């Protein structure tokens, strides 16, 4: 005689998203936690606002699907509005059976299920809008993993003065983004290999930037051996690019989600 069973159906990955649905999450499981197997007031005036904000959400959510061209989002968002949509009709509908009778046990369960909707539904809503964010972050890196290759074409010293002013700011934004991400991550492993990585990239910047200038002035003189100077360059790049990918790959790990191919 072996028995084991409980509830299910609630995902979560981002630190913020959790500290937003976590409460309503434990509340639901705690309301069903009474697994031993009391009347209900009038939830008419407190379920109408949950339907209110829920509407505003779909609103600001349906507009975001009209701006950001993130296709994978423009197609992953809609189904969400559907979830919260009907998940609400139950909440509002459930509140009725309880108003017409606040002792009904199917309603208490019916009510929870509907709430479990707006939660599970809003979850995807944020989750999706989030993966899209981790995306914009990848784009930034992809563009920083594309410019470095441009170093291998900087001959004139004057250009070096237009490569840094450019590469710099890029790495700057490519740093703040990573900083925030690590905070949002819910796994120690990722947070680490993600930070220490973006770390070397910062140090390797003032380096390749030198090998670039050291070469731009060495070729200007009879100083033969640009190899030991040039090689040092591309070598640094190759190191940065190899590191930058660890970031991307890591992010994509925390990115590619079920809804995705």
């Amino acid at each position: 005689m072996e028995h084991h069973h409980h509830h299910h159906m609630p995902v979560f990955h981002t630190r913020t998203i959790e500290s937003i649905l976590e409460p309503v999450a434990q509340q639901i499981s705690h309301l069903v936690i009474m697994h031993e197997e009391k009347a209900i007031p009038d939830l008419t005036a407190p379920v109408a606002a949950v339907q209110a904000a829920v509407s505003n959400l779909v609103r600001v959510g349906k507009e975001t699907v009209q701006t950001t061209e993130d296709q994978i989002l423009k197609r992953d968002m809609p189904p969400a509005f559907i979830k919260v949509e009907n998940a609400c009709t139950k909440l509002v509908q459930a509140a009725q059976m309880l108003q017409s009778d606040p002792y009904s046990v199917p309603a208490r369960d019916y009510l929870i299920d509907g709430s479990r909707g707006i939660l599970s539904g809003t979850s995807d809503l944020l989750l999706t809008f989030d993966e899209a964010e981790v995306r914009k972050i990848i784009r930034v890196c992809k563009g920083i993993l594309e410019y470095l290759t441009v170093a291998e074409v900087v001959e004139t010293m004057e250009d070096l003065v237009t490569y840094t002013k450019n590469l710099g700011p890029g790495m700057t934004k490519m740093a703040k983004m990573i900083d925030e991400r690590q905070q949002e991550l819910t796994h120690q492993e990722h947070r680490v290999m993600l930070v220490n990585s973006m770390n070397t990239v910062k140090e390797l910047l003032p380096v390749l930037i030198s090998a670039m200038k050291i070469f731009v002035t060495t070729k200007n003189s009879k100083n033969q051996g640009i190899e030991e100077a040039l090689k040092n360059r591309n070598f640094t790049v190759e190191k940065m690019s190899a590191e930058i990918n660890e970031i991307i790959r890591v992010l994509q790990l925390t990115s590619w989600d079920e809804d995705a191919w």
Binding site: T16, I20, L21, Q27, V47, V54, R59, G61, S115, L119
Partner: peptide
């Protein structure tokens, strides 16, 4: 504004499930 309106309904909902019990 998403993370906002979301948190909004999150509470607005958390305020409803509160009338479902309090021990």
């Amino acid at each position: 504004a998403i993370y906002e309106k979301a948190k909004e309904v999150s509470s607005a909902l958390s305020k409803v499930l509160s009338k479902i019990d309090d021990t």
